[PDB]
Design a binder for this molecule. Structure first.
Ligand SMILES: Cc1cc2c(cc1C)N(C[C@H](O)[C@H](O)[C@H](O)COP(=O)(O)O)c1[nH]c(=O)[nH]c(=O)c1N2
Ligand SMILES: Cc1cc2c(cc1C)N(C[C@H](O)[C@H](O)[C@H](O)COP(=O)(O)O)c1[nH]c(=O)[nH]c(=O)c1N2
Ligand SMILES: Cc1cc2c(cc1C)N(C[C@H](O)[C@H](O)[C@H](O)COP(=O)(O)O)c1[nH]c(=O)[nH]c(=O)c1N2
Ligand SMILES: Cc1cc2c(cc1C)N(C[C@H](O)[C@H](O)[C@H](O)COP(=O)(O)O)c1[nH]c(=O)[nH]c(=O)c1N2
Lengths: 361, 361, 361, 361
């Protein structure tokens, strides 16, 4: 299943299927006189208590079997080489089975210095996970943070089970955050974070968000494919929901606007360093990527190293061409917002002038 | 003719031909933390004095011959099983001919508990139909309401006759509503209800509306096909009017805005539980369907049962993914309106902020 | 030349080539309760001192040779039969040559009652045409009005000569209008009348306008074809100007807004009774057509009679479906303006609310 | 390299590749009564201390080798014949190597009267070019002005080196402008001038700007091709930046708005006299062209003479059809701005009403 998800994501057509990030509606303003030289560009930024080399992270994907651990090992060793944070996939299977632990632990063996982010699902909190399970997920990889994932859309359309997101999960999460020695990030899984969800999470003490908006890996498409494969009836219902979700660009605006002091990962269809530059200029603190890192990792270590070189060059290209000497300058560089993203923001009450102010701090 | 209409609708290409519901311009905001579990979602709602299981109805289509009665029987027995209200097609032929009565009456034999809605055409009121004919339509199926249909566009382009909609029809309707023991719904037939028509109807005491907007079954197209078939000249005129009408989404807004306390069926191209959810979030109380139910019913009882299962699942998926525990929560869930629907509303003086208040209260 | 124009217009691809009327941006609001019956719809309207049967006119095209006279004869006898006003083409050639007179005069022989509109070009007034030439054009067909045509775009791109539009032409026109016993209409020839041109003309006493906007017969395209045919260099310059001009729908708004008491023909790409209905609802008093009437007339009398039957039926269909009992009701019926037409009006300072008032008063 | 650039630009598909000038969003309002005759249209304008025949210039491209000098010769002799100013390509190579001088000097031999504009790169000013190098570039062709070019986008993606744009380059430019006897123009190279860049340049004494926006020659695409040719990794990064830059139309508005008294060349994808007319009406003083002149020059002298005849005719056609008797009238002619250009301006704080005033006062 963990294998089926990786196989469908890697080898089927589910990246941006019938969906959109709205990042085509964001334009970074070109500066013919940048005021800087390329070699002075500094891409360093903070990630909680650590310093990272590039404002980019690999968000959680996998682990739980030996083949999955070996993808994890490739990603972690390259992320370590580049000074990039790495999230692991859901650790539930390793909480339940001790054999599954090594496919996660290998990450910290091979990547001793970079931030490592643990992973459990929100529904677990209503299915009897609490402090201990969180502490075990964290300890298992000596995590610097834990991501708690929201995936209700995926769960609605998958052949098995049904989503459970009672508010008790948040009361529980809020208690756990009291006893935990590392921060919690709340992340979506391809369908995005709205302002109602961001505000609700914030009222429970959540300050760190990962948008994971639509336009990237389409998890409803992935479950549609799983349903097709088993002749399950839900397949054609999933098809009607292929464009369901908040587009990544809209989600970045919604979280930055509604929680101005959040620490924000902009992810969900980040595929180039230009996407990453746009996500940051729009209001993210860092850009997150999952699928393209998986596909590269599967090809090999050297393929993944080339991938990160390309992303970093493209990010720096966008910084050079906007006169942004550092990540901070990029966060306040000039942009244009047009088209559907503009209409979305307007309808949603995002005053574009107070937005400009909020994103530039 | 009643057969010709069924055959063209079922088997020719007239569903959304050159027309649009504007429902693509409506987005339901995804909630990554729904605040509920799937199993607590409650789809029950009121339909006049009865409780229905799902905020969906089958709107009037057919009856008047044995083969038509057997489609009615299938739809009625499945609607009964699902707790879904059902309208019958125009009852004129059974007012005139006693042989035609059974093809309507069968509906109540097979569906004893659900709301059943009778049907006569508005032009009949200027052609000498009154209280007695309405009472007979109602009594024939022990109806819980009567739909009075507007189809002037269909009548303009059909080979035979000409439309007649003098206001005397409404004075008469208003008198009838005084003596009748069930409510009157006024419905269109594929071309939509505007705010001028809604307000006029309302000034005569009409409080129940069924939008039946363009973007679904194209009745102008159906008449175009009948015209082509008989070498009638009007065919190419009908072709020019294929996109005539108020789109379903715009018609929902117009009626909810201009008559805030209306009981409102949003129909005309509702083809999925997602369309149904959108129509309800926009301001409808319930969503209506006709064509897709016909096509399923023609395939058989089990085909139609699977159809309703799919609609209901898709509806609940939208409720789940929006954090709507019940139909009432759905009616006030967050939306985005973009594109042509937005421009339509603006031009039509629909202040989007007072609209939000009206559709949510 | 007069024949080459007819031949290119009738048989080449120049109708709406790379151009647009903007009439797709105008929607007539459907009224599902019209409040009228089809048979009470009255299409009569005033045309100066005469009453016409339909708010439609055939605008000027041809005359000057026997074959051209025989097209004129067909158009005139059918327009007479339908109670429709008819303009003739430029009469210059018959002012110059007595042989050319009959191909214009035939129109009045065969159409003794309808309004007939004479035709001369604005540039003629700067090439020494005056009162007498106007009187002779008028007397030659016992005209009820004279159209003075603007065609600078055609003249710029045609193989021969160059346009001349000095204001002296207007001083002269203004003097002529003093001595003339019939009104002057100023018309364009495919490229439309702006507010600056309308206000200038109005300051010289012109109150009757015919928009002749882009989207219909593309005269720049016709001249491009003439250029291609003779290996003239201007062909590829004409190609760059194919979409030059004010779209018909924008031109109707611009003239109605800037001269609220104008008598206005909305023409340029009117191809159905729906186009005609839209043009009138937008602000025109009557709709004009040229090319489709030519093409039909060339096929024959019976073909042209069917053409007008179709136009008239489509017009009345739009009146029915909008609850318009007469032309006046149509002029104030509810519309929606979207898309590029809306952007054009906004940029051009056409306040949509003062526009509504002006088109309806 | 200088030849590789010419060969790719001339013979590969890089003109407007995945980019747009936004000039489709600018409409000149047609005037059916122009108020002028074609033969009185006056295209003369000022270019610093000289008078030019047409408000058009050939912007800098080439020089430095014999084959390049012979293209320069053709352009220069034709520009001289038409009274059109001409810029030369970067003179760096001729500052370094005396053999390279003649391929620039030939321009002044063959074009003794027209304005000739020298050329050096902004990065040279941080690599130790100063007063003397500027004087030598100017003296070598008896230049009437010197252009300093911004090409950071091209430099980012080219196989070799890295862009350097420290502000020291501007302090140095400011000093040089004090000792130079001819004006400095700052120009981009296909990616456009923003308001931040224009204002910064202005604060250092720059008053003359050449937009060189995206939508014309795509220099990122040219470097992409150079990269593909050498199997360089940056090719696929360049591909992601193909649409990077300020569109020419947006750049004209940004410079005119932020520096209302600037002398402004509108260039980047000017391909017809209609484009040139639109650029000028929008806010440019003159329109600039490079690529289409190169392509014509390569075909031959007579081909380039035909090219200029066509541009001039198209320009005058736009002036005739807007009632613009001279260049000054064109600068204040009526326009419509729509679509993405309108959204760009609005987002960028370009108040359209104060814009109207600035572009025509
Ligand atoms: C194969 C694979 C498997 C997983 C995912 C991704 C993929 C591709 N993602 C979601 C991921 O972190 C991310 O939010 C989305 O994929 C959107 O980003 P991309 O469009 O993939 O860059 C994910 N999320 C998480 O929180 N827990 C998990 O275990 C998984 N598993
Ligand atoms: C074959 C058939 C026949 C009928 C219709 C429909 C179809 C498909 N409809 C109109 C129907 O109730 C509905 O308003 C429209 O068809 C729009 O909804 P759908 O797009 O079909 O869901 C209709 N309406 C009604 O009030 N009286 C009737 O007799 C009929 N007849
Ligand atoms: C063959 C032919 C010849 C002429 C024309 C048209 C055609 C098709 N038109 C212009 C005509 O009256 C009308 O304004 C435009 O053609 C736009 O209307 P349509 O799009 O053709 O309906 C025209 N106008 C006019 O004032 N004097 C003329 O002599 C002619 N000649
Ligand atoms: C082959 C060639 C070579 C050069 C260029 C152009 C081309 C086509 N351009 C840029 C040019 O002046 C202009 O700003 C852009 O090309 C945009 O205009 P067009 O879209 O080409 O009209 C250019 N500009 C400059 O300032 N110095 C230079 O040496 C060059 N070299």
């Amino acid at each position: 299943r963990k294998v089926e998800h990786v196989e469908i994501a890697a080898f089927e057509n589910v990246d941006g299927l019938s969906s959109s990030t709205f990042l085509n509606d964001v334009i970074l303003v070109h500066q013919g006189f940048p005021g800087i030289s390329f070699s002075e560009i500094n891409t360093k930024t903070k990630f909680f208590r650590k310093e990272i080399s590039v404002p980019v992270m690999v968000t959680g994907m996998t682990g739980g079997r030996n083949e999955l651990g070996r993808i994890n090992k490739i990603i972690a060793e390259v992320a370590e080489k580049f000074g990039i944070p790495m999230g692991v996939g859901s650790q539930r299977v390793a909480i339940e089975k001790a054999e599954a632990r090594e496919s996660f632990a290998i990450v910290r063996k091979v990547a001793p210095t970079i931030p490592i982010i643990a992973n459990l699902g929100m529904p677990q909190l209503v299915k009897g996970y609490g402090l201990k399970e969180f502490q075990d997920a964290i300890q298992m990889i000596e995590a610097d943070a834990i991501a708690v994932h929201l995936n209700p859309a995926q769960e609605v359309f998958q052949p098995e089970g049904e989503p459970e997101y009672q508010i008790y999960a948040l009361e529980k999460l809020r208690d756990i955050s009291k006893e935990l020695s590392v921060p919690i990030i709340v992340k979506e899984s391809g369908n995005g974070i709205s302002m109602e969800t961001a505000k609700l999470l914030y009222s429970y003490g959540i300050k760190n968000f990962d948008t994971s908006g639509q336009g990237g890996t389409n998890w409803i498409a992935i479950e549609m494919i799983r349903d097709i494969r088993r002749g399950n009836w839900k397949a054609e219902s999933a098809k009607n929901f292929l464009d369901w979700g908040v587009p990544t660009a809209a989600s970045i605006m919604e979280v930055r606007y509604s929680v101005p002091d959040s620490f924000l990962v902009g992810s969900g269809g980040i595929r180039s360093g230009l996407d990453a530059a746009k996500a940051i200029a729009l209001g993210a603190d860092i850009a997150g990527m999952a699928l393209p890192v998986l596909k590269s990792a599967i090809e090999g270590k050297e393929s993944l190293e080339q991938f990160f070189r390309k992303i970093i060059f493209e990010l720096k290209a966008a910084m050079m061409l906007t006169g942004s000497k550092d990540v901070d300058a990029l966060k306040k560089t000039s942009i244009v917002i047009l088209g559907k993203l503009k209409e979305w923001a307007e309808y949603r009450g995002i005053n574009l002038s107070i937005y400009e102010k909020v994103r530039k701090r």
